[PDB]
Amino acid sequence: QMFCNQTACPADCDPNTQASCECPEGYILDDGFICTDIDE
Hints:
- Residues 1-36 form the EGF-like domain.
- By secondary structure, this protein is largely without helices or strands.
- Helix content is 0%, strand content 0%.
């Protein structure tokens, strides 16, 4: 459901696929409103 796409994506909360800014279980956005996580 929530996990951006392509390793890491922005958080365009799409009204049809609301799941890019809600982030996975506390996924936590990034320094570029990209809902993702790799290290720091």
